Design a protein around this ligand. Structure first.
Ligand SMILES: Nc1nc2c(ncn2[C@@H]2O[C@H](COP(=O)(O)OP(=O)(O)OP(=O)(O)O)[C@@H](O)[C@H]2O)c(=O)[nH]1
Ligand SMILES: Nc1nc2c(ncn2[C@@H]2O[C@H](COP(=O)(O)OP(=O)(O)O)[C@@H](O)[C@H]2O)c(=O)[nH]1
Ligand SMILES: [Mg+2]
Lengths: 48, 451, 445
């Protein structure tokens, strides 16, 4: 194999900063991409 | 309550063993007959000496250690020296003919006859442990007992003690000085074998401690009996928490949690300070930072590969006697402010620390310095790459010319083994270069927005 | 009546612990062998807060004393007051940690755990109303830090309406005494932030500058730093044990200190801090306490709190003194240093006042702060964790006691969220706009 290093010197180099995370915010926020049926909202006057 | 083993292999091991055991006796107040008629104590039980000595029904202590070379002579010397009655008769283990500086005598064709007789003595010392902590094993790379059998024993300890710490203490090859012509086969055949069976592997260099002895101990005639007495001050300082109570204790299995960043990167270099003569000791007040800064000078290292040619990466830094944690705090930070002392940017946590109340003893043999406080240190660095850069090309030259290979082969080996050992030592060459990489930045990389 | 258990674990936790049970033993006239011979009957009169009563008028602390090695428990029992403790409470193991938090959390500390819980049950089934449990432990160390995580987790599951308090020794701005302290710290924050009610952050660098620059100790020892922590423990727990104008227990601190059950890591302080010649050339008043106690050097973790905003404060003052004066000074700080505090919290400070000062003092004050200024410490842990983790360094020990490598990012994402959470509430005002109209466009420019 013509020899190489054996230590895991950079094994996590695919991950990146940081140093913060999110933040949780008023503009959505509980949703998911497949929660079907149960149409809005609001009775037949607003509207059906 | 807790216990450990010491093991002394080849003519380098058995002799650094005397210095260490000379000291430990003297440090604990144990005599050359194993008695301690020494302190008018009223309480007792720890007595942390029991970690290193076995007590006898009528108060003699016996060292928890084992000796080996493959001829008697170096052992007959202890056996008839001042510690005859001190050391346990059956822990002093002997062959007939020595391994000749041939690894294959030590690992393979001779080794095989006394390995299980050592292991029997060692299982019979675990039956005296109340909790076997680990093993501290003393040799040299240049001896063929010191290389071959130390690496046989590490094969065998890494099964019978597969969880416990196997800690080595090498005389490592000097840069310009040598003690065998077959020095490179030994160094690499042992290092390739222990590179999966040992936990840590600390280095001292005779070419380095000779100059410390002429320069700063101010001695004209540094013998191996004097130099092994200086090496003993590192061993007593590294074990202090397991010998005495202290402001900040360290465990047998703590060094490697802090010093070995990746399991193959296990070559921390060793040192002591302050090294003075008694007449110099009078022109130094020796405050904690003075010892610390001195302990960081390149010409003050007990390995002669210069730290000017590498980055530091992991330290453990150990203080004895009269010492204030606030002085340690500042003096450590002083060395980090001096980032001129080159260190890897990606380990600012580069230190572990330990502070022990018990001051050092000198083994008398000259005028005595009136010591108050002392420092010892283990450092992992890429200067070790500067050391190995030659020992490696020496194995390339020897092996290309096939010089001496018929002694080793005849006595239990095949050329394919000389290839594998060197191949892994070429991987290890890239390993101490990978820990020299100034790493790339990861900040400010993103995917762009989905529509 | 109202009982607390104390736990002490690893080396800094047992050493701080043997200043606590020296300081409080002495504050109560407890003898070095567990006799009582004290000089005010008030001392004896709420003794059960911290003690058991044993035969022949002997007294036993609710100390639980834990370790993975046998030496600190020799050095505490050979040590002063080592005879007040009960022998069945000395549950130390046989392995160390050797700074490995996972040797704590997954293997060896997990092997002691049932035997530590055995004395946690004994002591708590022998209380009449346990409030809580106090832990002196490490954070960047291992023997305390990795026991403490699992111990709090099981306690939180056996005792879930009892209070949970932690005296943690935090990694310092210039030095480390352990290399894996970022590992030891991040991992710990994940585990604790779900199960503590209170964590104190206590810095040896912040206490050294106190001890050397304000107390003028020529030689600051751990013995002298631990005197300060035990003064702190004593101080915030005075009203449980003695009469006072305004009494407050740990559940009464909690409710003023804790705006969201995530945001409960704090900085402490004590006052007065005074050198021996300065004791002549200073005069002790409630304003003197007040001045010194919001002063940037008096802070027992390594921040100037003017870098952020106080959300909540507590002040615990001991001795005989005007409740007018202490309201007044607290008003003055809140109004002449009003920008030190966050404004979406009004009137931001709890105060409580006890009639009994520290045995060696005329009067004293003890502060606790919740501030957005100490995020710099968690930023430091997050970056210094990254300097190890981005390279896989030291990870092979944790995985060798059999932790999962993914859990590192689970704790790191939590820390990175937590440090963002203190930052997003910093000067977290409301902002408002007015609606806008226009006139008609015309041909003329
Ligand atoms: N510092 C120091 N090193 C020593 C001492 N004795 C031997 N050595 C080292 O150990 C080697 C010399 O001793 P050897 O005779 O080779 O030891 P050995 O392992 O018994 O040799 P064989 O068994 O014959 O292979 C060299 O590598 C030396 O540098 C000693 O007292 N002091
Ligand atoms: N203030 C204080 N710090 C201590 C004391 N003992 C140790 N420390 C520090 O506390 C931290 C953790 O030490 P230790 O408890 O030994 O770690 P562990 O045993 O691995 O949990 C490091 O910063 C130590 O230097 C002590 O008596 N007081
Ligand atoms: Mg030999």
């Amino acid at each position: 194999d013509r020899v190489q290093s054996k230590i895991g010197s950079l094994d996590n180099i695919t991950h990146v900063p940081g140093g913060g995370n999110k933040k949780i915010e008023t503009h959505k926020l509980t949703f998911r991409e497949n929660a079907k049926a149960k149409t809005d909202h609001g009775a037949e006057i607003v509207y059906k | 309550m807790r216990e450990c083993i010491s093991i002394h292999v080849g003519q380098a091991g058995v002799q650094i063993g005397n210095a260490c055991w000379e000291l430990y006796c003297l440090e604990h107040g144990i005599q050359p007959d194993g008695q301690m008629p020494s302190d008018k104590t009223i309480g007792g039980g720890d007595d942390s000496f029991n970690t290193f000595f076995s007590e006898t029904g009528a108060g003699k202590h016996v060292p928890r250690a084992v000796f080996v070379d493959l001829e008697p002579t170096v052992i007959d010397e202890v056996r008839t020296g001042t510690y005859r009655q001190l050391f346990h008769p059956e822990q002093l283990i002997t062959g007939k003919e020595d391994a000749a500086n041939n690894y294959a005598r030590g690992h393979y064709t001779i080794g095989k006859e006394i390995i299980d007789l050592v292991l029997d003595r060692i299982r019979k010392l675990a039956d005296q442990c109340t909790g076997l902590q680990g093993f501290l094993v003393f040799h040299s790379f240049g001896g063929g007992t010191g290389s071959g059998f130390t690496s046989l024993l590490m094969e065998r300890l890494s099964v019978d003690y597969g969880k416990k710490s196997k800690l080595e203490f090498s005389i490592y090859p000097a840069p310009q000085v040598s003690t065998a012509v077959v020095e490179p086969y030994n160094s690499i055949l042992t290092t390739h074998t222990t590179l999966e069976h040992s936990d840590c592997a600390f280095m001292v260099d005779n070419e380095a401690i000779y100059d410390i002895c002429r320069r700063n101990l101010d001695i004209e005639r540094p013998t191996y009996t004097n130099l092994n007495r200086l090496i003993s001050q590192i061993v007593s300082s590294i074990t202090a928490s397991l010998r005495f109570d202290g402001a900040l204790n360290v465990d047998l299995t703590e060094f490697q949690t802090n010093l070995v960043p990746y399991p193959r990167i296990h070559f921390p270099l060793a040192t002591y300070a302050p090294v003075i003569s008694a007449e110099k000791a009078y022109h130094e007040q020796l405050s904690v930072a003075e010892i610390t800064n001195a302990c960081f000078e390149p010409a003050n290292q007990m390995v002669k590969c210069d730290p000017r040619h590498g980055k530091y990466m992991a330290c453990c830094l150990l203080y004895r006697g009269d010492v204030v944690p606030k002085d340690v705090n500042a003096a450590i930070a002083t060395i980090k402010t001096k980032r001129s002392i080159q260190f890897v940017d990606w380990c600012p946590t580069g230190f572990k620390v330990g502070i022990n109340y018990q001051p050092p003893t000198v083994v008398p043999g000259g005028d005595l310095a009136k010591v108050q406080r002392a420092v010892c240190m283990l450092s992992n660095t890429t200067a070790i790459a500067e050391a190995w850069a030659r020992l490696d090309h020496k194995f390339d030259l020897m092996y290309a010319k096939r010089a001496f290979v018929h002694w080793y082969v005849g006595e239990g080996m095949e050329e394919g083994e000389f290839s594998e050992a060197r191949e892994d030592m070429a991987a290890l060459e890239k390993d101490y270069e990978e820990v020299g990489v100034d790493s790339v930045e990861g900040e400010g990389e993103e995917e762009g927005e989905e529509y | 009546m109202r009982e607390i258990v104390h736990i002490q674990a690893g080396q800094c936790g047992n050493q701080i612990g043997a200043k606590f049970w020296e300081v409080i033993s002495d504050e109560h006239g407890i003898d070095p062998t567990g006799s009582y011979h004290g000089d005010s009957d008030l001392q004896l009169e709420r003794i059960n807060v911290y003690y058991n009563e044993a035969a022949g008028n002997k007294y036993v602390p609710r100390a639980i004393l834990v370790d993975l090695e046998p030496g600190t428990m020799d050095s505490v029992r050979s040590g002063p007051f080592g005879q007040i403790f009960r022998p069945d409470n000395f549950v130390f193991g046989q392995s160390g940690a050797g700074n490995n938090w996972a040797k704590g959390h997954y293997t060896e500390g997990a092997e002691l755990v049932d035997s530590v819980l055995d004395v946690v049950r004994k002591e708590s089934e022998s209380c009449d109303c346990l409030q809580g449990f106090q832990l002196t432990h490490s954070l960047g160390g291992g023997t305390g830090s990795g026991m403490g995580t699992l111990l709090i987790s099981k306690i939180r599951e056996e005792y879930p309406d009892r209070i949970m308090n932690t005296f943690s020794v935090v990694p310092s701005p210039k030095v480390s005494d352990t290399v894996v302290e970022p590992y030891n710290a991040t991992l710990s924050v994940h585990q604790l932030v779900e199960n503590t009610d209170e964590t104190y952050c206590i810095d040896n660098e912040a206490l050294y500058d106190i001890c050397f620059r304000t107390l003028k100790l020529t030689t600051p020892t751990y013995g002298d730093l631990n005197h300060l922590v035990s003064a702190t423990m004593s101080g915030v727990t005075t009203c449980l044990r003695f009469p006072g104008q305004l009494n407050a227990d740990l559940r009464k601190l909690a409710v003023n200190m804790v705006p969201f059950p995530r945001l409960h890591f704090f900085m402490p302080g004590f006052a007065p801090l005074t050198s021996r010649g300065s004791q002549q050339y200073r005069a002790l008043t409630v304003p003197e306490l007040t001045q010194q106690m919001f002063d940037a050097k008096n802070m027992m973790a390594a921040c100037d709190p003017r870098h952020g905003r106080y959300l909540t404060v507590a002040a615990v003052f001991r001795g005989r003194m005007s409740m007018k004066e202490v309201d007044e000074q607290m008003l003055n700080v809140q109004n002449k240093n009003s920008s030190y505090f966050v404004e979406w919290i009004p009137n931001n400070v709890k105060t409580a006042v006890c009639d009994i000062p520290p045995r060696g003092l005329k009067m004293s004050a003890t502060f606790i702060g919740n501030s957005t200024a100490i995020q710099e410490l968690f930023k430091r842990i997050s970056e210094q964790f990254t300097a190890m983790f981005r390279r896989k360094a030291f990870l092979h020990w944790y995985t060798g006691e059999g932790m999962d490598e993914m859990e590192f990012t689970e704790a790191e994402s939590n820390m990175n969220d937590l440090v963002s959470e203190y930052q997003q509430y910093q000067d977290a005002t409301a902002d408002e706009q007015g609606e806008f109209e226009e006139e008609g466009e015309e041909d003329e420019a």
